[PDB]
Symmetry: C2
């Protein structure tokens, strides 16, 4: 009752949860990855020299409290203009804000006020980060969006520049935290590039807060093929060490044959839950029906999940 | 008792005046031109198929009431992107809004609320307009921005499509107006293409309101070379007819040799005030010191001007 929550995640999965988690009596601090280099965000960091804003844009909208009209405007994506075509008005909005203030965090902060955000959203770092991936067979793929495309098995990921630093408010928030949520989002392309910022795993270990890891429901082609729940947990323990996760929240129910097939048409399978290996890794298991279909697509159901992670 | 004022102007001059006029005890309605095809606006109307927002953006920011920080964001102009470079964030914001509403006017309406606009801003038309100039040598030059670039003399400008229509709010505001203001803005590329919208000139003649025409201080290369004050008035009557202007407002003091010189390097000379030709045309003349040097460039000083047009 009146808990401080920090969420390390990325992608659509994180916005879904955030749109729900905010109606609970919890103070949210969402630290967003700044390593993506795909799509609009990718072009923007290259031609504008700023951190990719895409993920922050979506976290921002999810926690926003404004008219639908304005929310659509912020989410507007241009269809034509070739050079403008593909960009998200919210991305360009954020890009312009960080130019003026010359500080990405500060820009995100100013946008929060505009969007009337309940809480705080911080970038994992105030400068661009590059995601690199070492494959099972030693091959190195550089670039967040290129890793999955390599079609190989990921062995380990790492950030660059090595001297990358998190925001003070970041470490600060992890301290005051009552609960730390690892995820939801891609294991290697969103959750780890967040956690891997220098000082974060460490800061999290020291925190006395309860750490809940929202494990993926589906696998991802070229990233987590064949992974079970423990395979995910393992990868995190390997990159961050023990005491980074206390309980792992999983979807322990079946997935419809229909949804299962739509994903299958994408080399994505349900993430099997090995209750035993999980208990072996020393973490508790929060298992329940934690998802819901949305036109043959699975989303987390923020209400249920938020309730769970809040004990 | 708020006095209702309607303003037909364009460009920087319109923004400058508005910024000051809004502080007086009046209710403003600014009908903005949508015939411009140059720069960022030209690019947008071409690839996004919407009316040019630039001129509207400057009126929106001018009558707005937000924090300086937001006001800059709106006025932010991207420097790189080579497909994004040149574009104004405020133009794109307006473009995005109009895409969502499918209505330029409505889009503008929504942005007013966002920007807390003190008054009503309306586009001359809800669809794009093309400006054409009939030169002295019978030739025709199409496109607002190619006209001055022709290096010839303008005999007359006209609009396309012929079936272009104003907004009902426009005819309405003119009816209810206590004062109608023609200008400031370029005679042939800002004011006339605005007035020339079907129904506008007529609606004005029928209006029993006071009609003040703010004449240009400087001439413009390729548009009004060598034009005197009366040459300007003449063009307006020759296009809209009599009963369109009651009094002409002109800067009757000298301009500094310093300003004069800078403008000279642009083929821009001061507009000589022919007291007699102005009288022969049957309009009163308000002559005072209505300008001020702003970094050697000439602006208007809305206070002094607003005070005059309000009698």
């Amino acid at each position: 009752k009146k808990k401080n929550v920090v969420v390390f995640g990325g992608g659509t999965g994180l916005s879904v949860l955030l749109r729900g988690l905010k109606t609970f009596p919890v103070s949210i601090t969402a630290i967003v990855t700044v390593a993506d280099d795909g799509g609009s965000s990718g072009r923007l960091r290259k031609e504008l020299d700023i951190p990719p804003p895409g993920d922050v844009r979506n976290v921002l909208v999810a926690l926003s409290e404004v008219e639908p009209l304005l929310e659509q405007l912020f989410q507007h994506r241009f269809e034509n203009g070739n050079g403008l075509s593909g960009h998200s008005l919210g991305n360009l909005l954020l890009a312009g804000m960080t130019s003026i203030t010359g500080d990405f965090a500060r820009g995100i902060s100013e946008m929060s006020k505009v969007l009337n955000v309940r809480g705080k959203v911080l970038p994992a770092s105030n400068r661009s980060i590059i995601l690199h991936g070492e494959m099972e067979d030693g091959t190195i793929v550089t670039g967040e969006s290129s890793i999955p495309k390599a079609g190989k098995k990921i062995k380990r990921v790492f950030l660059t520049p090595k001297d990358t630093k998190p925001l003070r408010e970041g470490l600060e928030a992890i301290r005051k935290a009552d609960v730390i949520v690892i995820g939801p989002g891609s294991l290697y392309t969103s959750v780890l590039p967040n956690l891997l910022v220098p000082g974060i795993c460490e800061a999290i270990k020291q925190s006395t807060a309860r750490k809940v890891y929202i494990c993926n429901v589906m696998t991802q082609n070229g990233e987590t093929d064949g992974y079970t729940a423990s395979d995910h947990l393992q990868a995190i323990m390997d990159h961050c060490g023990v005491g980074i996760v206390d309980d792992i929240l999983v979807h322990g129910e079946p997935i419809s044959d229909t949804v299962k097939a739509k994903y299958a048409k994408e080399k994505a399978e349900p993430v099997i839950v090995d209750e035993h290996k999980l208990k072996a890794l020393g973490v508790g298991t929060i298992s329940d029906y934690f998802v819901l279909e949305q036109d043959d697509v699975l989303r987390h159901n923020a209400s249920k999940v938020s309730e769970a992670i809040l004990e």
